[model samples]
Target: GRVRLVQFQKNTDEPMGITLKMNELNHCIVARIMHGGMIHRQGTLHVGDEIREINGISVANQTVEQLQKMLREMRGSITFKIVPSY
Candidate 1:
């Protein structure tokens, strides 16, 4: 799988506005990008991208709920390392 990195800047009070899901292998995947949301506006992420890291930390073992919780509390510059499911 090819790796790709994308970054976003956000406020703590604002959500990243993305929905996540887990595949059978338990990898965190980007399920959806909310319409008109910041992520959507940026146009980097797409549905089915598997998340491998956040900033410089690996999220390989994280669940959908766990990543959601972490992302909810995230602020400032955020970077994601993902494997495109193309």
Candidate 2:
């Protein structure tokens, strides 16, 4: 229903914290999260979590959208970071 993002000093020169694949419709596809990532914090979001929407906007089912600049701006930490998705 909602999405969130996070930014940190460590990511300054690094590429996006997340990556993606492209689906047949040309929409971004989901992929596994890299090991030892910021998202791997305690109760952190996981690799296969379906990014249905982001920053109050639907990702168009394109996993890459979540890694794009739009959603990356909403970076932060919250208690409810993890969801039922695996």
Candidate 3:
């Protein structure tokens, strides 16, 4: 896997428009991104990207709900530390 850092600066009330799931390795992975959403518009992320952390925080022992909550709890200028699918 390759590392890719994705950032969203213009925060809004809209959702992030990404779905995350755990693979057999229990690593947090980007499962899908909703079309026409802000994240999709960002266009740097892929479905297979393994999320390593957010805002310097690790993704270990995190669930989709909690992660999403964490995501939502964050203000603008979100940084995603991710490992690419390739």
Best model per lDDT:
1
lDDT of 2 at 74: 43
lDDT of 2 by residue, 1-86 (tens): 34444323333433335565555765443465556655444334555444544444555644465455553554442222222343
CA deviation > 4 Å runs, candidate 3:
none
Candidate 3 lDDT, tens digit per residue, 8-54? 87467667777889887779998889998888887888798889988
In order of TM-score, best first, we have 1, 3, 2
CA deviation > 4 Å runs, candidate 2:
1-16, 25-29, 61-67, 71-74, 77-86
- Model 1 CA lDDT for position 64: 75
* Best-to-worst ranking by lDDT: 1, 3, 2
Q: What stretches of model 1 exceed 4 Å from their correct place?
A: none
- Pairs that collide in candidate 1 are none
Q: Model 3, 8: alpha-carbon shift in Å?
A: 1.1
Indicate which candidate wins on TM-score. 1
Model 2: lDDT of residue 13: 35
- Per-residue lDDT tens digits for candidate 1, residues 1-86, read 89989999887577788899988888888888898988999988889998889888888777778888988988889999998887
TM-score of each: 0.89, 0.46, 0.88
Model 3 residue 5 CA deviation in Å: 1.8
